[model samples]
Target: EMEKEFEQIDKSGSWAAIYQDIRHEASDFPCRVAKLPKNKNRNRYRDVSPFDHSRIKLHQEDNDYINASLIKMEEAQRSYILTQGPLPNTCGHFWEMVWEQKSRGVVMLNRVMEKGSLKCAQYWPQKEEKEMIFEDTNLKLTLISEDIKSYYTVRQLELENLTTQETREILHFHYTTWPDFGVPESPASFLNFLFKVRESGSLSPEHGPVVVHCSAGIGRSGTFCLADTCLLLMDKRKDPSSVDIKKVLLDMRKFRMGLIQTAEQLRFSYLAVIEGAKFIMGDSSVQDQWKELSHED
Candidate 1:
């Protein structure tokens, strides 16, 4: 009866079921898709492996591909300041700083923290090593900390570090978080951080341009720069229709390579700025209003 049933099965229409039944009849169908195998010798499927979850998490977290694209943007901008020549079997790395003398004699101090040192300093200068301080004619040097371990408490430490003698100074922000990479945080959290920085009286044009840095001073650094620039532009005009977004980006890249690298990164930075500005302006209605006004009458 079993042989007759097997023979009567449609060859092409239901071959899968027939084959499965035959396989089961001839040998034990020990493998299961949903459950882990009990026999150690038979547990060859990688889905049941202990490392699979971690492997997936790592893959999702990896941003090397995006970073590589950012490198190309960096090259185009020629913003990389390297202390060492390109190393074999290593990713491209460089040091950089973005400065804008908008008649504000105060210089913004931005630095990236990595490996317990400022990312900008490829070779830490002895005079400024351990603790180096600088004072501009119009600006005071305040709050210099590297290798930030805690973001929540770092701002307080920075405020305490500034000298009382100077009224206006730069807060050399050492960036540790990767804007384009790492565990992405909510947009609201990011805007809140910036707001907190402003509330602390740490960021001011009179002090100088807000300085920022991350490892290589490109990816995350670029994102920070773009965000600030966008907000400034948006504040000047409730609607940024007249603003040249691409040109703004190009200029930024001209100042520092890879300022806004990949399309996705550019998109991310744009969205962050939009969301942050909306939060700052206190209304979602403006976006719709702008859209309505832009339409032909």
Candidate 2:
């Protein structure tokens, strides 16, 4: 079933037409995300807003402001904390949320600088750390290991609870090829990146939730979550044809305001999900053709 659909998507003309329909259909969905009360210069970007219902609220003790959302795909049983890349000012709150939520890893989908502009702040220590304690969350994060790859980098971050003096490791997966405000050079590269993160085992439920963020945390970030969740659904159903890629994306949007931002992005998500489902349903080309996708985090 999906193979035939993929045939049309593979054609040059199909996505242009399909994307128009998606955009038109998306117009009627309520824009309740506009409900987040205005804060002067708070968000990294204006368009990226979290839904009131699913926004992750920091403990009042942390002073309560971080542009992050908690997206849960219950049927697939995957939980993701979708957030904007931390601002220099909110870096403390970012780690605070990490400690409070018990997140075991952070899946960063963009680089600190892209197209010659700062897309995200450098929020971690380079090879290690000072006995760093976040004044807000009072947690210390130490870089225990560093591994660099062509398309991504992995950092083993040790997050410590200062009050309790307890420590835990956080896997940091950074995808480098995806451009700011744009899709990857190919869905293959992004999928290869996703599988690398999957193999790390940090995405499992034993951890709080994987913090998946890009600059605004909507465009590429949404693409990553939608692709992974659909692949998870395909595995659980044991049938690639059974998963409704469009439906699943719509459901995800209910949690975060604008997921899968551009129609082009949505199309790319489709391509990647189809490719991933192919892998789960017994094809190795998706991973084999993109061998460089494997490496760290």
Best candidate according to TM-score: 2
The TM-scores, one per candidate, come to 0.43, 0.88
Residue-level lDDT tens digits of model 2 in 1-297: 656776777676577676555545542233254444644345788767776677777785424667888888999999999998988777878987888888888999898988888789888777574545577667787888888877778889888878889988889988888876578767667887888788888797887989999988978898999999989988888566878777787778777767777777877888788777768876864467766444322
RMSD of each: 21.3, 3.0
In model 1, how many backbone clashes occur? Answer: 4
Candidate 1, superposed: residue stretches over 4 Å from native:
1-175, 179-184, 284-297
lDDT of 2: 0.78
- Residue runs of model 2 more than 4 Å from their true location after superposition: 9-12, 27-38, 129-133, 284-289, 292-297
Q: What's the residue-level lDDT of 257 in candidate 2?
A: 65
Q: On a 0 to 1 TM-score scale, where does candidate 1 land against the true structure? A: 0.43
Query: For candidate 1, which ten residues in a row score worst on lDDT?
Result: 51-60
lDDT score, candidate 2, position 68 = 85
